[PDB]
Design a protein around this ligand. Structure first.
Ligand SMILES: COc1ccc2[nH]c(C)c(CC(=O)N[C@H](CCCCCC(=O)NO)C(=O)NCCc3c(-c4ccccc4)[nH]c4ccccc34)c2c1
Ligand SMILES: [K+]
Ligand SMILES: [K+]
Ligand SMILES: [Zn+2]
Length: 363
C-alpha cells in the first residue's frame, strides 16, 4: 500500500518556529528528502484542525484563551499561568495556529488510516504528549496524539498507544485513564525530580480503565539491546492481552545518545527494532515524533526510522543538502553510544516486568 507522509512546505515552516526545537522540522524533512525517501511515500498536505476537532479533547475556555493570547507575543497575560502558559510553554505570536496545524496534521494522518489509504501514516512534527484538556505542559500546547486517537476511535474499538519518548506520556494516559478502549504503554525515565514525575509501574489507570495503562520506569544509561528486550517483552504481553486493532506510536528522539538531557544512551537501531516489532502486527499505525534536542541526531534518528518503515537500508554517508554541515565533523548517519554506565539493575527490570504481567492478567 505504501506509507502516507504528512508534509507541506507551509506545514514545515510553521513547525520551525518553536523555540525549543528551531528548524528541527526542516532538518528532519530535508534529510528524508536527501535520502529520497519521500519518493517512496504518498505525500499528503495536512488540514488545519477546526475548533470542534480540537474541542474533541480541549475545553473551549482553553482554546479561546490560547487563540486570544496568540494575537502578538505575550508571557504577560494574567490568566496565562493557570492555562499552563508561561516559562515551559511560553505564549508567543502565532502559537495557536502552530498548535492547530500540528493537531490538524495528526488528525489527517488518522483519517488516512481509517479510509484504508495506508497501513502507516507519519507526522514527525506531532507527538506532543503532555498537554491536558485545559493546560499546556512540557512544551505541548495541544495534545495531538490524543486528537489522533479520538479520530481513530471512529473506526477502531481497541487502540494501543505506545510511547517511546524519554518522558512519560502523562497527558495521553490521563485522557484515557478511565476507559478500556485505549491502552497506553509508556517506557520512560522515572526518577524523583525528573519531569513529569508520573508513571511508576504501579500506575495502571483508574475505574473502568484499571489495568489499561502500562508504565515501564527505566533508569539512566540504558542501551539498545536491553531496551529492546524490555520493550519486546512488554509489548508481547500487551498484544496477547489487549489484541489492539490500531496503534499510535510516539518516537521522541530524546532517548538517543548525544541528547542534552543526557539520560538514556540509545541509538536509532534499537528504537528501530521496537518499531519493526510493532509493524510486524500489520495494523493501522500512526507514527509521531516528540522530544529530541540534538537536532542533527533527531533528524538522523527519524530519517533512519523512516527507512525502516520502508524496508530500506540507508547509505551511512550523509548526502549533501541544505543542512549538510550540521552533521559535522564525521557526516555519518550512525550514532555512537557514550561511555556512561547503565544504571538499570536486571532484578528491578524483572520486578517491573512481572508486575506488568500480573496487571495484564486482568485485561
Ligand atoms: C517532578 O517533575 C516535574 C513535574 C512537573 C513539573 N512542572 C514543571 C514546570 C517542572 C520543571 C521541569 O522539569 N520542567 C521541564 C520539563 C521538560 C519538558 C520536556 C518535553 C519532552 O521532551 N517531552 O517528551 C524541563 O526539563 N525544563 C528544562 C530543564 C533543562 C535542561 C535539562 C533537562 C534535563 C536534563 C538535562 C538538562 N537544560 C536546560 C537549559 C536551560 C533551561 C532548562 C534546561 C516539573 C517537574
Ligand atoms: K515515553
Ligand atoms: K486507558
Ligand atoms: Zn521527551
Amino acid at each position: 500500500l505504501v506509507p502516507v507522509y504528512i508534509y507541506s512546505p507551509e506545514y514545515v515552516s510553521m513547525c520551525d518556529s518553536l523555540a525549543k526545537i528551531p528548524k528541527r522540522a526542516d532538518m528532519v524533512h530535508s534529510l528524508i528528502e536527501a535520502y529520497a525517501l519521500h519518493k517512496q511515500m504518498r505525500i499528503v498536505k495536512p488540514k488545519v484542525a477546526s475548533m470542534e476537532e480540537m474541542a474533541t479533547f480541549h475545553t473551549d475556555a482553553y482554546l479561546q484563551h490560547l487563540q486570544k493570547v496568540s494575537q502578538e507575543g505575550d508571557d504577560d497575560h494574567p490568566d496565562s499561568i493557570e492555562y499552563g502558559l508561561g516559562y515551559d510553554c511560553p505564549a508567543t505570536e502565532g502559537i495557536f495556529d502552530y498548535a492547530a496545524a500540528i493537531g490538524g496534521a495528526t488528525i489527517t494522518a488518522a483519517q488516512c488510516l481509517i479510509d484504508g489509504m495506508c497501513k502507516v501514516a507519519i507526522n514527525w512534527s506531532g507527538g506532543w504528549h503532555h498537554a491536558k484538556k485545559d493546560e499546556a505542559s512540557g512544551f505541548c500546547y495541544l495534545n495531538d496524539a490524543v486528537l489522533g486517537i479520538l479520530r481513530l476511535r471512529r473506526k477502531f474499538e481497541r487502540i494501543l498507544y505506545v510511547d517511546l519518548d524519554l518522558h512519560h506520556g502523562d497527558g495521553v494516559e490521563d485522557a484515557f485513564s478511565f476507559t478500556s478502549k485505549v491502552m497506553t504503554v509508556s517506557l520512560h525515565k522515572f526518577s524523583p525530580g525528573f519531569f513529569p514525575g508520573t508513571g511508576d509501574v504501579s500506575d495502571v489507570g483508574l475505574g473502568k480503565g484499571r489495568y489499561y495503562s502500562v508504565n515501564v520506569p527505566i533508569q539512566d544509561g540504558i542501551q539498545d539491546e536491553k531496551y529492546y528486550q524490555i520493550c519486546e517483552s512488554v509489548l508481547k504481553e500487551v498484544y496477547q492481552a489487549f489484541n489492539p486493532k490500531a496503534v499510535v506510536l510516539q518516537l521522541g528522539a530524546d532517548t538517543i545518545a548525544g541528547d542534552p538531557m543526557c539520560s538514556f544512551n540509545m541509538t536509532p537501531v534499537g528504537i528501530g527494532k521496537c518499531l519493526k516489532y510493532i509493524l510486524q502486527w500489520q495494523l493501522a499505525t500512526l507514527i509521531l515524533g516528540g522530544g529530541g534536542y540534538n537536532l542533527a541526531n533527531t533528524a538522523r534518528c527519524w530519517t533512519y526510522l523512516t527507512g525502516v518503515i520502508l524496508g530500506k537500508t540507508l547509505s551511512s554517508e550523509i548526502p549533501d543538502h541544505e543542512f549538510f554541515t550540521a552533521y559535522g565533523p564525521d557526516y555519518v548517519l550512525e550514532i555512537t553510544p557514550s561511555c556512561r554506565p547503565d544504571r538499570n539493575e536486571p532484578h528491578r527490570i524483572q520486578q517491573i516486568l512481572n508486575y506488568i504481567k500480573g496487571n495484564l492478567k486482568h485485561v
